[PDB]
Write an enzyme that holds these catalytic residues in place. Structure first.
Site, PDB file in Angstrom:
ATOM      1  CD  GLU A   1      -2.653  -1.319   5.677  1.00 52.20           C
ATOM      2  OE1 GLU A   1      -2.498  -0.193   6.080  1.00 52.20           O
ATOM      3  OE2 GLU A   1      -2.319  -2.352   6.199  1.00 52.20           O
ATOM      4  CD  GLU A   2      -1.319   3.161   7.503  1.00 51.41           C
ATOM      5  OE1 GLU A   2      -2.079   2.896   8.421  1.00 51.41           O
ATOM      6  OE2 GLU A   2      -0.166   2.756   7.150  1.00 51.41           O
TER       7      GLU A   2
ATOM      8  CG  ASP B   1      -2.921   4.313   2.149  1.00 51.82           C
ATOM      9  OD1 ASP B   1      -2.702   3.273   1.749  1.00 51.82           O
ATOM     10  OD2 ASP B   1      -3.759   4.316   3.267  1.00 51.82           O
TER      11      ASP B   1
ATOM     12  CG  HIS C   1      -0.381   0.346   2.591  1.00 48.51           C
ATOM     13  ND1 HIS C   1      -0.292   1.191   3.121  1.00 48.51           N
ATOM     14  CD2 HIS C   1      -0.091  -0.848   3.550  1.00 48.51           C
ATOM     15  CE1 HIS C   1       0.302   1.238   4.284  1.00 48.51           C
ATOM     16  NE2 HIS C   1       0.345  -0.155   4.507  1.00 48.51           N
TER      17      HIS C   1
ATOM     18  CG  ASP D   1       2.844   0.879   7.835  1.00 51.64           C
ATOM     19  OD1 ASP D   1       2.319   0.405   6.739  1.00 51.64           O
ATOM     20  OD2 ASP D   1       2.128   1.091   9.028  1.00 51.64           O
TER      21      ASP D   1
ATOM     22  CG  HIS E   1       0.470   2.953  12.540  1.00 54.32           C
ATOM     23  ND1 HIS E   1      -0.792   2.546  12.786  1.00 54.32           N
ATOM     24  CD2 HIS E   1       0.956   2.707  11.404  1.00 54.32           C
ATOM     25  CE1 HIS E   1      -1.183   1.921  11.540  1.00 54.32           C
ATOM     26  NE2 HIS E   1      -0.200   2.071  10.644  1.00 54.32           N
TER      27      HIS E   1
ATOM     28  CG  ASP F   1       1.637  -3.734   4.465  1.00 53.18           C
ATOM     29  OD1 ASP F   1       2.355  -2.732   5.053  1.00 53.18           O
ATOM     30  OD2 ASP F   1       0.615  -3.683   4.178  1.00 53.18           O
TER      31      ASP F   1
HETATM   32 ZN   LIG Z   1       1.191  -2.319   7.626  1.00 58.01          ZN
HETATM   33 ZN   LIG Z   2      -0.023   1.419   8.830  1.00 67.15          ZN
END
Ligand SMILES: [Zn+2]
Ligand SMILES: [Zn+2]
Ligand SMILES: [Zn+2]
Ligand SMILES: [Zn+2]
EC number: 3.4.13.-
Lengths: 479, 479
Positions: A170-171, A103, A101, A136, A449, A199
């Protein structure tokens, strides 16, 4: 050196300057999918990636439009396109679909970052790359392309037909992707023999892993409303009921400070601990000291390795994220918020049913709220859900990946599960009816994150070479 | 028509265009004292006001520098200047000091405003002015100047020597002002005979009031810290202790959904209800229906008039404002916040001691937290405190103000207390040893600290004429 993997490994080293360059441009486009004002950035990110695909050998490139942002606030904003591409079309080769992903989580310097989150800082002396999205998931995603390039530059035959599926939501719940995969199972994805996803991360910081399990995630918001607008907390204090006051009680009834979820019905759905599953859990390398290093404190809820692992991997968890609609800036504000949203999520494990869990959660919240004897309005709703996933780590892919890891890092990887989630993993498995392998690039202290998200260059390079050998070995495996 | 108040009343009507104009410019400068990025705006606001003072007849103008922002985060930002001025210097006249504040609560359109909060919308057809700060406190403040102008334009003798004390930190703890008043009690304020403040509202929307009592305010933040940075709630969920989880418990232990404060020790400090004080409470006009109108809902905690009034005026209250350091934007974020600040304040009444209350609050929070058996760090600190104030509504000023109100609004005002707070009110009384009168301009539904803050033109004009007659009558009273 299967069809000269050493050639490919060498080109991977030589091409680090272009890989770095490619990764810098990508990281600079702030594809924050949760931020409407940056949606255009997300499109540029997708555009940039499709450009890299095309400059490398990829074909049949499709920027698939999921449609307009829907579900449960959108000014008819289009969704980020899912990026489908193929590299190679040899009918005698296996076809591997890779998903990732593009994003990324929001980020701001003032959050505590040492560097500017969207300026990728590459330090070859410490061997780290610092930037939002670098682990990520933009680093791992682009790695697949680097790898195609390295085979190309090494004049070595690419061992499989690669097929790509890169989303940009995805986020933000991976909206509508679910339908796409199912819709395209007998279409764009018809010939797929296997799916690989990079991921997630190593368990710790010292030893590579292969991942055979993910927890799911149910994200909830409890909404409590009272007055029609915010109230001066002095004029109305002690005289009108406060949504914030009810909310501390409802939210504070979901889980204790030991981690015990307090919602009736959940424990019953939790699959019991088997001797089979218990076998895999031993021989893992991990200690609370490592957990403390990644945490930056001594605040674990468990000291026993088995406990830390099982409570990350196979027992559910409930986390409380924050409140929307109240006063959250620094200092003081004397206000009674009118309408507040409490944010909390549950990590699901087998055998928790999404539906039932949601009912249990609503039942609990409604009942707690009603017992408050409050004139306020209240209701709890699901924001997004993503399935848990468990697989047997012995199939062709893990074997291929195991030998690949062994080759690059000189040890065999631990076989691990994940506390984190990759929602569509189950949809790939079921819709396409193939096995799925999770091939973590980074370490468990990468700060996804969080502030100062990093990717160690050793994992970047090591992971690429591991991806290369894995495709090679998989192509050789009898099944 | 004491020295022709009708002349002054007429000029007040005629000068509405310049008053409106003056008020528009003021409202347009967003003096948000809580916002560092707007500090410069706050200075422009002070500058603008001093300019109005000077253009009217004022002299001895002093922009007093309290110094650099201190207390309990500041990049050596200077504080907004306190504005001192005099109008008239007749040694045979009484001297009235008027206080108000030119800073304002933050505001944004997206909060739910129908108009842009810093574009003053004046609708003479509905008779309302909409804008942030229009009732709290820029409208009332400027009213004093309008009044000086009206006496001037009417060729009528100004009945007292006016002295001004306008600060720009009222919405941010009124920092350092305390010291200024005490320091200047035998200086700039030496000759003061009385203090008037227009910085609150009518109880309801139909009948003017004079205010003889204010609750104090103690603003607290409970700080809970765990990991050194935010944690991915999936990787670490169920395995590290969460500051947010502890915080819901600590915060949720302060007060129930009925309004009962749960902190030991407070009730003991609450002065008992007397027959004297009970006398004043009757004959007030108010009903829960009015409370519901201002609230925009049916969420009162009491139906009896006496109860609503006593719980706004003379029983303490505890409000919960919001959380700093967690996730507060819309949608979902899967994060374990590292360090959170719970915001809550207590409205104080007699005879609550500030110090003791703070100890009780800390004792309660520390004990609750410790009973959590959490590895996290925790402590509760005071952000700002402001004293409660109670006075006897029979002295010269209230009599003068009562006749003034009667003259303009054709009824005698109710005598009321305030749920809100004006921190320095007690400092004026004690340091200068004079009486203080509170002369509310606006209505109780003006929306201070909320969206769509309004000032009814009838209160604007009515309040100015009331201020004019009050100064006139006070000048005539034998004491
Ligand atoms: Zn991830
Ligand atoms: Zn993430
Ligand atoms: Zn205010
Ligand atoms: Zn005020």
């Amino acid at each position: 050196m299967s069809h000269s993997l050493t050639s490919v490994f060498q080109k991977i080293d030589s091409l680090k300057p272009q890989f770095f360059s490619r990764l810098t441009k990508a990281i600079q486009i702030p594809a924050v999918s949760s931020d409407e004002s940056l949606r255009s950035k997300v499109f540029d990110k997708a555009k940039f990636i499709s450009e890299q695909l095309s400059q490398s050998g990829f074909h049949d490139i499709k920027m698939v439009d999921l449609g307009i942002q829907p579900p449960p606030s959108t000014p008819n904003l289009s969704l980020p396109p899912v990026i489908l591409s193929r590299f190679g079309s040899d009918p005698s080769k296996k076809t591997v679909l890779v998903y990732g992903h593009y994003d990324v989580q929001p980020a701001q310097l003032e959050d505590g970052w040492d560097t500017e989150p969207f300026k990728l800082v590459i330090d070859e002396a410490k061997g780290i790359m610092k930037g939002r999205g670098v682990t990520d998931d933009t680093g791992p995603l682009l790695s697949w392309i680097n790898v195609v390039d390295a085979f190309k530059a090494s004049g070595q035959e690419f061992p499989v037909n690669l097929v790509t599926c890169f989303e940009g939501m995805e986020e933000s719940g991976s909206l509508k992707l679910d339908e796409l995969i199912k819709k395209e199972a007998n279409g764009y994805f018809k010939g797929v023999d296997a799916v690989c996803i990079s991921d997630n991360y190593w368990l710790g910081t010292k030893k590579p892993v292969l991942t055979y399990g993910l927890r799911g995630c149910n994200y909830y918001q409890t909404i409590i409303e009272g007055p029609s607008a915010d109230l001066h907390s002095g004029i109305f204090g002690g005289v009108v009921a406060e949504p914030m006051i009810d909310l501390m009680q409802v939210l504070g009834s979901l889980v204790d400070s030991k981690g015990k979820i307090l919602i009736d019905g959940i424990d019953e759905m939790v699959a019991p601990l088997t001797e089979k599953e218990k076998a895999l859990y031993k021989d893992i390398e991990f200690s609370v000291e490592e957990l403390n290093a990644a945490t930056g404190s001594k605040t674990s809820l468990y000291d026993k390795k088995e406990d830390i692992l099982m409570h990350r991997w196979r027992y559910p968890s409930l986390s409380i994220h924050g409140v929307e609609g109240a006063f959250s800036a620094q200092g003081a504000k004397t206000v009674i918020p009118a309408k507040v949203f409490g944010k909390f999520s549950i990590r699901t494990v087998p055998d928790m049913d999404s539906e039932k869990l949601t009912s249990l959660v609503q039942k609990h919240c409604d009942a707690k709220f009603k017992s408050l004897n409050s004139p306020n309005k209240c209701r709890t709703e699901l924001i997004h859900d993503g399935a848990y996933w468990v697989s047997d780590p012995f199939n062709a892919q893990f074997t291929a990946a195991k030998k690949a890891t062994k080759l690059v890092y000189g040890v065999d990887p631990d076989f691990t599960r994940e506390g984190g989630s990759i929602p569509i993993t189950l949809t790939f498995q079921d819709a396409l009816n193939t096995s799925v392998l999770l091939l973590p690039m980074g370490r468990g202290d990468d700060g996804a994150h969080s502030i100062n998200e990093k990717l160690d260059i050793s994992n970047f390079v090591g992971g690429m070479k591991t991806m290369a050998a894995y495709l090679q070995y998989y192509s050789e495996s009898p099944e």
